């Protein structure tokens, strides 16, 4: 089971971060109650054509508060490779109803952010 959305890829030295209010991915089939959750940095280690293990660019995946690989973490929990985002008016309640994405039944939404939101240096389009 996977993120409902595609990933933000970190190409610079600096981790993913969002100003208060910013960062929740756009998706209809969500009331303002549901605009809260975390991005989780994945690790991708694949061997290259030369046989040596490669550390590929980190991918950050959004999950709704109370869902996915860190469904246990309370909002704002300080932990490496986890950042929190909430749109104003979201509710500190697990988003069980939105759950996680099943890759067989559903393609992942493209992650787009309302224009104007700030991405750290190193994150592209």
């Amino acid at each position: 089971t996977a993120s409902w959305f595609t990933a933000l890829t970190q190409h610079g030295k600096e981790d993913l971060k969002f100003p208060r209010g910013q960062g929740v991915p756009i998706n209809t089939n969500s009331s303002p109650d549901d605009q809260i959750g975390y991005y989780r940095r994945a690790t991708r280690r694949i061997r290259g054509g030369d046989g040596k293990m490669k550390d590929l660019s980190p991918r950050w995946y959004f999950y709704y508060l109370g869902t996915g690989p860190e469904a246990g973490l309370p909002y704002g929990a300080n932990k490496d490779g986890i950042i929190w985002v909430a749109t104003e008016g979201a509710l500190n309640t697990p988003k069980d109803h939105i759950g996680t994405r099943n890759p067989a039944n559903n393609a992942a939404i493209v992650l787009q952010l309302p224009q104007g939101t700030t991405l750290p240096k190193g994150f592209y389009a």
């Binding site: 996977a2 994945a42 991708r44 280690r45 694949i46 061997r47 290259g48 991918r59």
Partner: protein
């Protein structure tokens, strides 16, 4: 699928089909991966095939390669009837689900 028909002139029809030569490095169980790399790792794939459909081809190939020796695998801990029910991830050296000359086959997706 269907060869593409490309037409020149009054009546000349060239039929063109496109393929990728895919070589898979298997990463399912280290104790048997090398037999898989030797037996069922070469494929010729139509450039438009969806990778999750090519995955199914590869899956069927490891099971077909492994039925004959199923009884040497149970002591190892390997149950083919559960291997045959599992999800096969195919991806390139960048961890993308994209056909490539060299791909990896694993039971666990590239992002972790």
């Amino acid at each position: 699928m269907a060869p593409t028909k490309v037409t020149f002139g009054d009546d000349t029809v060239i039929e063109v089909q496109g393929y990728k030569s895919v070589n898979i490095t298997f990463e399912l169980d280290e104790r048997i991966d090398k037999v898989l790399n030797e037996k069922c790792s070469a494929y010729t794939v139509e450039l438009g095939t969806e990778v999750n459909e090519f995955a199914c081809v590869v899956a069927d190939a490891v099971i077909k390669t492994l039925q004959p020796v199923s009884e040497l695998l149970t002591p190892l801990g390997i149950d083919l009837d559960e291997w045959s029910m599992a999800t096969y991830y195919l991806f390139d050296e960048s961890g993308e689900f994209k056909l490539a000359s060299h791909m990896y086959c694993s039971f666990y997706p590239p992002d972790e």
